[PDB]
Design brief:
Chain A: Belongs to the protein kinase superfamily. TKL Ser/Thr protein kinase family. The structure is cut from a larger assembly and holds chains A (473 residues) and B (172 residues). Chain A has 473 residues and is mainly alpha-helical. Chain A has 26 helices and no strands. In chain A, α4 (64-80) packs parallel to α7 (107-120) and α15 (255-271) packs antiparallel against α16. Chain B has 5 helices and 6 strands; from the N terminus they run βαββαβαβαβα. The chains are: A mainly alpha (473), B alpha/beta (172). The interface between A and B is medium-sized, with 25 and 19 residues.
Chain lengths: 473, 172
């Protein structure tokens, strides 16, 4: 048992004959891969088992045997020994990159090296060492790419920090390389996932959108992947959706493609409504693209937004994006004003919107978006007037603007909402005393901003005009 | 014998006086009216032999929510409760506002927060009636002493909830 393993590791330290050491390493690798016990993981974790092997492989590069089986042996050891990654750090990256550099031109030698690199990069804190080497790891992996086992899809983590100029260089060269990968490996779900999220990672710089939209290749490929490759895959749809969200800009007038992606977005939010995975990205993307497109679907959007608020109350971002989408939809489509409300067959989204505002007072963005949404809703349908007033909206937002004063956008949205709320209604002296001083103080605190002043003046205008004695005070 | 003060707060038109009339004046349902100012009620409970407790229920008018909730009402108070109608999430947000206000402007001799109970007013009304799963989020998040559904008109659970709350209050 362990005595034979001790003899093998002792003989491994001799480094006498390359062929004999190769056979011993092969026998040790064959014996180690078993489910009998953790004898191979005897807690020693001695580098003397594998450091001389990699030294011999690097120095004697012509020895293909140690290259072929030493990588498999270390892969099996890492997959078996739990603290092997802990033994890696606290180097080996230099050794593996030299292995990939000098003599890994064979398919068999390359695949094991890329697999070992992929499993090593799942540990963390070693990527910095990999990116600060001298072997040009990005050039190595680019030179690596028609094999089905595309282990180079582990290039993922390398995009986490690449800098803008090198990112543009990767955009060009790696896009030229990766289009072939996605075309020849269309029937590989994991490969499609990795390629799509690598596109996500490289799409961070703003200047590269024009490069990505050189011939609408990005839009077409992502739409085709969403349509065909993944009818019922959550990860693919989520990644493609995040690409859709990050690829919205001044060039949004991709009219036909607009319509296409819009449909796909609907499909996405209708087929996986359980996590932020799709909801936030699609709703923000959808809101902008719906504005552009509109210049049925609206009912589906209302339903999707209602479940988005309902099922993700704990996340600020989801509710913000969803209520913003509801606002942007209602702005361009007013026919559904009666389609929403407390009555049966209509989504009670007004209470959900109010809830969003109250449950995230600490954030100005949620207040801004939800306030604009319910202000547009109140302006659309007159029936909702005096209902939210009876529900506690006026004094509540007054206290909220008292809490949030450092920004002008929040004050402007609040004043606009008061204007569209209090229109066509008559208040009492108590409401006057509870409204006028607070809005006057808010207007004083933000005197320079023109929209805030306009909305405040409009609100005061719509709101200003025994009983005589009280009114005099 | 002992005396105590309980302050009932909540949104407007939530039948704030309905519950206090039901528990003390034995008046339930009735017409829905607006409470202009703070009103008072007395309750006497024979909790134990030779131990009779008196309760002063102050039903704070929620119309002036934007107005500064003066600490004089909560001054010398021994207990409080927030009761909101179940047909509006705005009553729920208002209850959050009341909870924040009382946490900011209420003190006890031991310094610990006084017991608070979440009353789900008028559950005998469609459609948002038994949504206890949504209520549980704030029930465990706000750290309230208790939470209990109720119906002022039917008086289905006013007595048990009030007994639980007062037992918790004397437990301190």
């Amino acid at each position: 048992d362990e005595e034979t393993l001790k003899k093998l590791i002792v003989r491994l330290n001799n480094v006498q004959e390359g062929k004999q050491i190769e056979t011993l390493v092969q026998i040790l690798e064959d014996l180690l891969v078993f489910t009998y016990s953790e004898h191979a993981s005897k807690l020693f974790q001695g580098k003397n088992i594998h450091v001389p092997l990699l030294i011999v492989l690097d120095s004697y590069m012509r020895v293909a045997s140690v290259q072929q089986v030493g990588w498999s042996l270390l892969c099996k050891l890492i997959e078996v020994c739990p603290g092997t990654m802990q033994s890696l750090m606290g180097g080996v990256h230099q050794l593996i990159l030299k292995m990939l550099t000098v003599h890994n031109a064979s398919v068999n030698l390359s695949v094991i090296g890329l697999k070992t690199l992929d499993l090593l990069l799942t540990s963390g804190k070693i990527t910095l060492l990999i990116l600060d080497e001298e072997s040009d790891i990005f050039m190595l992996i680019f030179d690596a790419m028609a094999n089905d086992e595309q282990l180079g899809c582990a290039l993922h983590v390398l995009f986490e920090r690449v800098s803008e100029e090198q990112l543009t260089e990767f955009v060009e060269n790696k896009d030229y390389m990766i289009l072939s990968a996605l075309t020849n490996f269309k029937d590989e779900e994991e490969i499609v996932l990795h390629v799509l999220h690598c596109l996500h990672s490289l799409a961070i710089p703003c200047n590269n959108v024009e490069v990505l939209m050189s011939g609408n290749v990005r839009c077409y490929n992502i739409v085709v992947e969403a349509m065909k490759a993944f009818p019922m895959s959550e990860r693919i749809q989520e990644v493609s959706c995040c690409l859709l969200h990050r690829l919205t800009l001044g060039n949004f007038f991709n009219i036909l493609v607009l319509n296409e992606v819009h449909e796909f977005v609907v499909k996405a939010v209708q087929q996986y409504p359980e996590n932020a995975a799709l909801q936030i990205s699609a709703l923000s993307c959808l809101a902008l693209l719906t504005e552009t497109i509109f210049l049925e679907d609206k009912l589906f959007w209302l339903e999707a937004c209602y479940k988005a608020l309902t099922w993700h109350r704990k996340n600020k971002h989801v509710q913000e994006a969803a209520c913003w989408a509801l606002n942007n939809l209602l702005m361009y489509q007013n026919s559904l004003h009666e389609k929403i409300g407390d009555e049966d067959g209509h989504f009670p989204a007004h209470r959900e919107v109010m809830l969003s505002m109250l449950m995230h007072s600490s954030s100005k963005e949620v207040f801004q978006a939800s306030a604009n949404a319910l202000s547009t809703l109140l302006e659309q349908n007159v029936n909702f007037r005096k209902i939210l007033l009876s529900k506690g909206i006026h004094l509540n937002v007054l206290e909220l603007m008292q809490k949030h004063i450092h920004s002008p956008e929040v004050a402007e949205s609040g004043c606009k909402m008061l204007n569209h709320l209090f229109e066509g209604s008559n208040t009492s002296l108590d409401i006057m005393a509870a409204v006028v001083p607070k809005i006057l103080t808010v207007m004083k605190r933000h005197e320079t901003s023109l929209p805030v002043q306009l909305e405040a003046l409009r609100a005061i205008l719509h709101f200003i005009v025994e009983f005589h004695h009280k009114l005099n005070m | 014998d002992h005396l105590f003060k309980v302050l009932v707060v909540g949104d407007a038109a939530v039948g704030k006086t309905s519950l206090v009339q039901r528990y003390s004046q034995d008046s339930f349902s009735k017409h829905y009216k607006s409470t202009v100012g703070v009103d008072f009620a007395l309750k006497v409970l024979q909790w134990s032999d030779y131990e009779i407790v008196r309760l002063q229920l102050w039903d704070i008018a929620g119309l002036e929510r934007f107005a500064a909730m003066t600490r004089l009402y909560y001054r010398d108070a021994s207990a409080c409760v927030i009761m909101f109608d179940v047909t509006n999430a705005t009553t729920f947000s208002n209850s959050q506002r009341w909870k924040q206000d009382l946490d900011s402007k209420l003190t006890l001799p031991n310094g610990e927060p006084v017991p608070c109970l979440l009353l789900a007013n008028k559950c005998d009304l469609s459609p948002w009636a038994v949504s206890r799963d949504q209520i549980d989020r704030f029930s465990k998040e706000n750290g309230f002493t208790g939470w209990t559904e109720t119906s002022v008109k039917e008086n289905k659970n006013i007595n048990e909830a009030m007994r639980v709350l007062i037992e918790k209050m004397m437990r301190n």
